[PDB]
Amino acid sequence: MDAVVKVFCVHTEPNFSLPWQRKRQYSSGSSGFIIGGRRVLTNAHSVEHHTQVKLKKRGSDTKYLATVLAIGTECDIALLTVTDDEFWEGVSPVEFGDLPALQDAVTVVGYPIGGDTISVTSGVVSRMEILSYVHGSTELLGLQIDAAINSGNSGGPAFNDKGKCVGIAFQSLKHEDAENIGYVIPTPVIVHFIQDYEKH
Amino acid sequence: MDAVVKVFCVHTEPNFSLPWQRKRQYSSGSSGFIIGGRRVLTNAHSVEHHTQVKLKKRGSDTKYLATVLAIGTECDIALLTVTDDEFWEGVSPVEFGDLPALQDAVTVVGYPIGGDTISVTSGVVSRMEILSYVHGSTELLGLQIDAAINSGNSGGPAFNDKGKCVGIAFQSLKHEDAENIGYVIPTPVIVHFIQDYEKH
Amino acid sequence: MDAVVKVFCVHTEPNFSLPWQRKRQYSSGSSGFIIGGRRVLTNAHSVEHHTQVKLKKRGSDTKYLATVLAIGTECDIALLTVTDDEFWEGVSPVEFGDLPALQDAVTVVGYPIGGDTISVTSGVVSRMEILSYVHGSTELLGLQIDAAINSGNSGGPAFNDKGKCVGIAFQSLKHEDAENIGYVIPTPVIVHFIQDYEKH
Amino acid sequence: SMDAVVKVFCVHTEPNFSLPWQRKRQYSSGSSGFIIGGRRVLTNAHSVEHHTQVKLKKRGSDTKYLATVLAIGTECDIALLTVTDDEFWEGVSPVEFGDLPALQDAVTVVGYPIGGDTISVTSGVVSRMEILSYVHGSTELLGLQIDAAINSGNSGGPAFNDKGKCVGIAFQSLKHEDAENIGYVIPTPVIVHFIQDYEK
Amino acid sequence: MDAVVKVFCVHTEPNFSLPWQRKRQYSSGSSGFIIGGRRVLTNAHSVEHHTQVKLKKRGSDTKYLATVLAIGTECDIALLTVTDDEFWEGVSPVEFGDLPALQDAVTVVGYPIGGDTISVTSGVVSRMEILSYVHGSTELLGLQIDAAINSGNSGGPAFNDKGKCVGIAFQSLKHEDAENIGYVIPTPVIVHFIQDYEKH
Amino acid sequence: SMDAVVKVFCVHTEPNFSLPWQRKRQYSSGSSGFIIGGRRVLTNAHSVEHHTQVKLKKRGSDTKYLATVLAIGTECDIALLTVTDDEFWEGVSPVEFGDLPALQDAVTVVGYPIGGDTISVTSGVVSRMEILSYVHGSTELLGLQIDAAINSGNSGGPAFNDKGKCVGIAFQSLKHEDAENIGYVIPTPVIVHFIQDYEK
Amino acid sequence: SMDAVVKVFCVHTEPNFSLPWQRKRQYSSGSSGFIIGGRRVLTNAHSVEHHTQVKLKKRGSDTKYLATVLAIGTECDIALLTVTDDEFWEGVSPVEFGDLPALQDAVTVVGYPIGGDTISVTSGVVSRMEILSYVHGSTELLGLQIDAAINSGNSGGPAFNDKGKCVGIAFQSLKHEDAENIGYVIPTPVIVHFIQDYEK
Amino acid sequence: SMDAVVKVFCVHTEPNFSLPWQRKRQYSSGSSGFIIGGRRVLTNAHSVEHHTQVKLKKRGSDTKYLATVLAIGTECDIALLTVTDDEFWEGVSPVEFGDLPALQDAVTVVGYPIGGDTISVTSGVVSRMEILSYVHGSTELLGLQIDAAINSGNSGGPAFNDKGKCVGIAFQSLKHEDAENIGYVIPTPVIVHFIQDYEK
């Protein structure tokens, strides 16, 4: 919970809102969390086309300059780091616990957009998407929860009953929104993502 | 529950509904509840620009003239009192119990608008907003429940399992409404609010 | 459950759908249930301006001619009876059990409109409306459940966990509909209604 | 012919139960009408329904006049009225009916928006015609549609052609609603049948 | 779960989307599952007017040519088979367990449209539709669950707590969709359907 | 050319299962059509689909006539009909086709609104044209759009220019719907291709 | 009279609590206004409400000018302004008012869309007139409606007739909204009453 | 100038993750454009974004031509294209630009609706003008709005005045959408600035 940081970046809108005007851009909010090895997880869709991403811890007002290590394209995950060491001082990385089951309560921790306070959201795993290799083995690919993740929270951690992390959280964009539906990327995807980065 | 009073005031609409007509105004309903020390809590947004606010207890038809002690601007809380002593006769102030947790059942008691009957609404704490001081300490700032608070109920008390009060209740105004989403101001905010009043 | 009958009547629409055309009318469906003393409960809003209301039991295709004893105006309740004795043969009236509490599961049994099959709907008591006399005593006035009652079901019985009746059920008309919100008239209202009839 | 247009007041009781345990909600409504030849006033049937008494108001004063309901249509939404007070009729030229309108004719609709005492004048053009046919090949105008939304209180007011002559009674579409820009007018042949069926 | 297959067919739209253009058609997705006796269950509405339906198992990319045995008209059920024996090799048909009760958790397994991954959806039986013969006996006719079945999933199996099948699943088409409402055809209907086929 | 416009009756069975355990809902529908040269009637393809028999009604009488389906379009929503009864054709002048219309042309659409036997006449103007091109640079009118909503029952009726000559078949937009004020017309070249492809 | 049209800047604080535990949200808003005779500027009352100071901008430069609030209407949404800086008034011809407009008159509305500094010019026609009546039979224009949507920032800007003379102040409909194509204009008599009531 | 209007093909990858664990969805899109002087084609910037290659199609044939992206606007949604194939340009007269349009001018928009190869021609009138101002009092046309909805595939196509001369590039409103009947056109001055900034 002290590992949950707020992400600041500049969001350039995808569309011309009027054909005779430059694309509207403005500063946006997002969430992330500290994992082991001086790394911060967050979503990709908030650090794309970035010029500079700045982080912020809970009690402090001090912003820090993050360094984009990798930006996923197969999944909405970004891997960051910070050069300053004052950032990593006195903060405990999250721990990754057991994969949740259907109807399991999850908790999503993030910073709602336009503020510095932390929001904690309760949700239950209402749907799972499951990968299936030709080997015969199946890994967990997607989680859906029955609670809406408000805008700024996207990219924060999702915890199980035991305060252990079970993935990254995402506001439901497609279809209709704010209708009590959220998404979560399970740990195996996060693993593969880091694996593909470290190895290559 | 016998501490829950109905609030009568005059609500002047925020907008001209037609640019050539005076702002539409009419009498409105709201809810509140008796706390210790001859004080009544309710929301601010029902007593702003007031000329006179009148209260009413459950079984009686008698209205009483309330006296606005303070109107919050940092939070939607108003502090009232009544000079008549017949008001405070034979009524027990609510008791403030333990802060609720996620998924905790809460109960919201208020008077629905346009009637004298009491409505009791069941809801569960679906989200929490948490303050964080530079000291390192965190206090509870906001509660969201998974049940809609209908109009007149706003300002009434919210109780935990043990019939103990855990805050003031509010109809969700912003975003979409009546979609099973309500707000509750936790006790620490109410405390700070009274503290800022008494001390100053 | 064998006490739950289907109600047939002619519904004349409230509005001219075109100002130059007679009011549109057509046959409608509704639900009711057998209580003690050769009486059938149902809603008022399906037997208003009636010419003739016809009932029907579960397994039989035979319709029976009902006789409107009373039509409520303070509450949406109608009291019927049937002169034929073949109707009351081999059918057990419902039994009225304890008043439900918040979050109590209820079951609503009725005939969905346009068919002869029975629908059974699960819902939980999500809200209560409470009367308060000047004496100091409070009786239960209204129940709201977190499940939608589809059209034809209105007027059927609502049961508690123990298969005992706890009131009459109603499709939510006002505000928005089919958004998982139903109403139920508690037993004390049904009692008062019958009392006001028998005594007068 | 501004002076012939009057505001209709009647107590409207809703067709539905707002809640199954309460009386049908009931409140004062507003509507329009107009003075014709022979001490008569035309307005809509729907506003004067029930056996509530109806009041009339004229353009200049706030004086209300008690009206007598002569006939309430059922084949069409027209009601015929009169007023005993001789001062009601004094110094008012009744409307004069004109030629049947054709497609694309410009019309003008005069009435009192609900809630206010001021007169409204809405432009519109005949967008659709409904036409009745007889067993010998004769044709009669049954309905008119205009490409203008008629606001609630205006129903019952007159519709005029370019030459200021009345050409039917104006009505709002009850479904659809509202800014679909559709409006209905009952043409004179129907009004004539209504009155002939009254007199005979 | 290894018995759950993906269904490929060509869906010809029901309407001309423009009156001067041929009806729009395109390839669609659907779900089904293997039962005993070299048979595959699925919905009818995906194999109507078919030219050829092709199946696919979980880990394999190999498609197989299915053979439409029967297409229901009383219920949305299709009965398929495959001539290839490599299809039925090493796959265990589902087992049919006890009929669920109200509030019973069910699980729906299917392939979401436009992908090969398996989706697993949690839902609870929120409503039952019950048949009633003149004999006096009642069989279960319909199940409704409080979770939406996304498009491609329709036709897959629904399981109870014990991983035993309790019917075929269906996306809610009528009324509003994706509002957390799904349908399931209970086992007795599936039985009757197969009975009517085998016997005739 | 009012006399040439006829009302089409056909039993319409819906394309979807209303509930997966019931027969597809099925009910009588209404539509429009019109008499042309050579003992033929034009109407839409969608109303006469399935092998249901279709009846026709004329403007004056309530007599229905059994129709014969000669050809049902697939490249366009047109059907060609005829009637054996000689009395159907007696004393009716068929429609006469006119010049290709241009953008901003005023058109008139004649038909029978669903549910009634009276004739409707809707104004409209050509707002958009869809144009086909050939491998040599030739152009042909493919579709017309008008800025008027065509109500359901009117589909199949004729569209006329200022000079009263037919200029295509009228259709309602199935999506969008409804008061978007958009309407479709199939122009004469397409009708001509449909008939030439019939005869040849 | 482009040069007389100015952009109004004011800090707008919302009428509602976004969340009950936060300050009412507050942000800079934009609006329009225009220069009239006698060192005065007309704009709307709603933008300049609260005791926030208001700035003005002219067509060519980005220079803002501090404005003085002379009078804020309550019977109508009009505010009268002035600016001390003499350079504000230099080289600007104030608007000239013209004849009362009639139904179907073409009007033109000039203003600054919110968020930008460029001038917008919207076409429209008078679709409805609201008319006031006196106790002696006199009539005065009270309100105008146009069949064009006025975008947010344009409220307060001028409305012109065919001859370029001002004919009222333009306003957007706050409910309905937005592409209902409805717009409001306060006609000159009301403006005149506002100013006479100011001076006197 | 039908022959100058071409259909643009480009592979469009969406700006959002459909699901956080999948690649951003990606599919072939369609758009319009037109041939101008000097071996150039104008179309919109948004369709040709990313470094996907773009193909062009002409009115008569289904032949596609590989296009070269010369310049993609950022201050406006315009892209400048060319094609190496000499046969693309053969026998095609480029569009000719005409006078700046005024309010209420009739315009015509030519383009290819998405999904099809046929040409669409939409009527419309200039409903609003956005006007830029310079630090000395000069004015330039910045944007045009028309009272016609431009369907998706038409964006990039030309807009013509009564005299058939081009008068800007047509665009659909991305929000609002769709039958609000609003359409955008970038007028020639902006196109001219785009090209001058290209050449220089």
Curated annotation (Swiss-Prot), chains A, B, C, E:
Domain of life: Eukaryota
Active site: 45 (charge relay system), 76 (charge relay system), 154 (charge relay system)
Tissue expression per record: Expressed in roots, cotyledons, rosette leaves, cauline leaves, stems, flowers and siliques.
Induction annotation: Induced by trans-zeatin (at protein level).
Subcellular location: Nucleus
UniProt-annotated stretches for the region Serine protease: 17-194
Disulfide cysteine pairs (residue numbers): none
Complex and partners: Homooctamer formed by 4 homodimers. Interacts with ARR4.
Function of the protein: Serine protease that degrades the two-component response regulator ARR4. Regulates ARR4 stability by targeting ARR4 in the nucleus for degradation. Acts upstream of ARR4 and regulates the activity of ARR4 in cytokinin and light-signaling pathways. ARR4 mediates the cross-talk between light and cytokinin signaling through modulation of the activity of phytochrome B.
Family: Belongs to the peptidase S1C family.
Name recorded for this polypeptide: Protease Do-like 9
Native source species: Arabidopsis thaliana (Mouse-ear cress)
Gene: DEGP9
Covered residues, full protein: 125 to 324 of 592
UniProtKB/Swiss-Prot annotation, chains D, F, G, H:
Bridged cysteine pairs (disulfide): none
Region span, Serine protease: 18-195
Expressed in which tissues: Expressed in roots, cotyledons, rosette leaves, cauline leaves, stems, flowers and siliques.
Entry's localization field: Nucleus
Induction notes from the record: Induced by trans-zeatin (at protein level).
Active site: 46, 77, 155
Role of this protein: Serine protease that degrades the two-component response regulator ARR4. Regulates ARR4 stability by targeting ARR4 in the nucleus for degradation. Acts upstream of ARR4 and regulates the activity of ARR4 in cytokinin and light-signaling pathways. ARR4 mediates the cross-talk between light and cytokinin signaling through modulation of the activity of phytochrome B.
Subunit structure of this chain's protein: Homooctamer formed by 4 homodimers. Interacts with ARR4.
Family: Belongs to the peptidase S1C family.
Name of the protein: Protease Do-like 9
Organism of provenance: Arabidopsis thaliana (Mouse-ear cress)
Complete-protein stretch covered: 124 to 323 of 592
